[PDB]
Structure 1
């Protein structure tokens, strides 16, 4: 499913992400936009053979099992396939563990490069929230 901006902001808010570990809603929406263009079915393979999945492009080396990443750790206890669903619950729950892992949102390269330090509040402007 391809989310609209306000629609995604509203789902992420409901799922407890606004200000989770100090990151305002706008940070999460911005990350999604640049990681996946708001498409839950986005997948991308990395050179190391791991794959990034879903709206938040969570990586198969540490976070989910895809059965093809030798020595993955499966930290979120979930098949990577679950991160592609139209329901973002599994994606959000895993993201909460990643952001809590010690580097905050810097775990998301597109956040660090394209969101961090920008006016992220622009991503939830106009939304009914």
Structure 2
């Protein structure tokens, strides 16, 4: 599923991401925009053989099991395919674990390079929230 901007903002708010670990909602919408272009089915293969999955491009080396990432951990206790669902619950719950790791949202390269330090509130302006 390809989310609309405000549709995704409302779903993330319902699942408790607004101000989670201090990151306002616009940070999460901005991250999803540049990680996946709002597409729950996005996948991207990395040079180390791991793959990034879903709207927040969660990585199979640490967070989910895809059966082909040797020596990988499954810290979110989910098959990576669950992160491609039109229902974002699994992605949100796993993202909450990731952002609680030491580096916060710096774990997402696109957030660090394209959202951090910008007017991220613009990503939710005009939305009925």
TM-score by length of 1: 1.00
CA distances 1:49-78 after superposition (whole Å, capped 9, x unpaired): 000000000000000000000011100000
| Counterparts of 1:102 and 1:77, CA distance in 2 | 20
Give ranges in structure 2 of 5+ residues lacking alignment: none
1:107 Cα deviation from its structure 2 partner: 0.2
Compute the RMSD of aligned alpha carbons: 0.2
1:26 Cα deviation from its structure 2 partner: 0.1
1:103 Cα deviation from its structure 2 partner: 0.4
CA distances 1:61-103 after superposition (whole Å, capped 9, x unpaired): 0000000000111000000000000000000000000000110
| Counterparts of 1:52 and 1:5, CA distance in 2 | 21
1:110 Cα deviation from its structure 2 partner: 0.2
SS at match of 1:121: helix
Give ranges in structure 1 of 5+ residues lacking alignment: none
| Counterparts of 2:108 and 2:40, CA distance in 1 | 16
1:114 equivalent in structure 2: 114
Aligned residue pairs total 129
CA distances 1:36-58 after superposition (whole Å, capped 9, x unpaired): 00000000000000000000000
TM-score by length of 2: 1.00
Structure 1 segments of 4+ aligned residues over 4 angstroms from their partners: none
SS at match of 1:91: helix
| Counterparts of 2:90 and 2:19, CA distance in 1 | 19
